[PDB]
């Protein structure tokens, strides 16, 4: 009974869902997976891409809960 969520990468729809996560109080992949009802691995890839942008730093790796933070 999995839900149907728009995962299509488009010109318009793609750049509206990549800028909704930081608009919440408690923002973590587990919280987004229980609340917004999308795989936590998508949030993991999102914060990995945020790391690739060079605005945060990795600390540890885990198949469930990753650790990327900032100190500035």
């Amino acid at each position: 009974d999995k839900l149907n969520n728009l995962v299509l990468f488009d010109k318009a729809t793609y750049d509206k869902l990549c800028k909704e996560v930081p608009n919440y109080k408690l923002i973590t992949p587990a919280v987004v997976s229980e609340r917004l009802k999308i795989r936590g691995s998508l949030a993991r890839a999102a914060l990995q891409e945020l790391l690739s942008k060079g605005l945060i730093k990795l600390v540890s790796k885990h198949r469930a809960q990753v650790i990327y933070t900032r100190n500035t």
Binding site: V7, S41, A45, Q48, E49
Partner: protein, 143 residues
């Protein structure tokens, strides 16, 4: 980590008719000869990693593994990864396909039925061919 592929709601591999509900690439039970350690060996021999995103995985990998399964004997790869080996009527491992057909050939009971043997009717009634004890344990097989 962005792919230009589109989400496909119709995808067909081997002309089966099954529901698409869970994830892919290890729910391939509908595909009979790909998976587990053989597929892992082939993929590691193909030099591909897990850098991309999961969930949205296409069928190029399974097609390549099937194609390399088409002609496995040339490279002297250990040929203990195929279902029916050293079978009657062919000393070479011939290919077949389609659903509703592997299950029948998993039990080649025609010749043993012909020879008027007890093992044919051991297989036929769905009962125990090697002799699993069934009088206090082993009541499953029909439930």
């Amino acid at each position: 980590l962005v792919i230009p592929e589109k989400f496909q709601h119709i995808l067909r591999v081997l002309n089966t008719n099954i529901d698409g509900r869970r994830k892919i690439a290890f729910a391939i039970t509908a595909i009979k000869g790909v998976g587990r350690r053989y597929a892992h060996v082939v993929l590691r021999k193909a030099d591909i990693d897990l850098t991309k995103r999961a969930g949205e995985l296409t069928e190029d990998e399974v097609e390549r593994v099937i194609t390399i399964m088409q002609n496995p004997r040339q490279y002297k790869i250990p040929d203990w990864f195929l279902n029916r080996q050293k079978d009657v009527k062919d000393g070479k491992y011939s290919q077949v396909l389609a659903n509703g057909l592997d299950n029948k050939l998993r039990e080649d009971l025609e010749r043993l039925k012909k020879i008027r043997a007890h093992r044919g009717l051991r297989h036929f009634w769905g009962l125990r061919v090697r002799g699993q004890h069934t009088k206090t344990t082993g009541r499953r097989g029909r439930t």
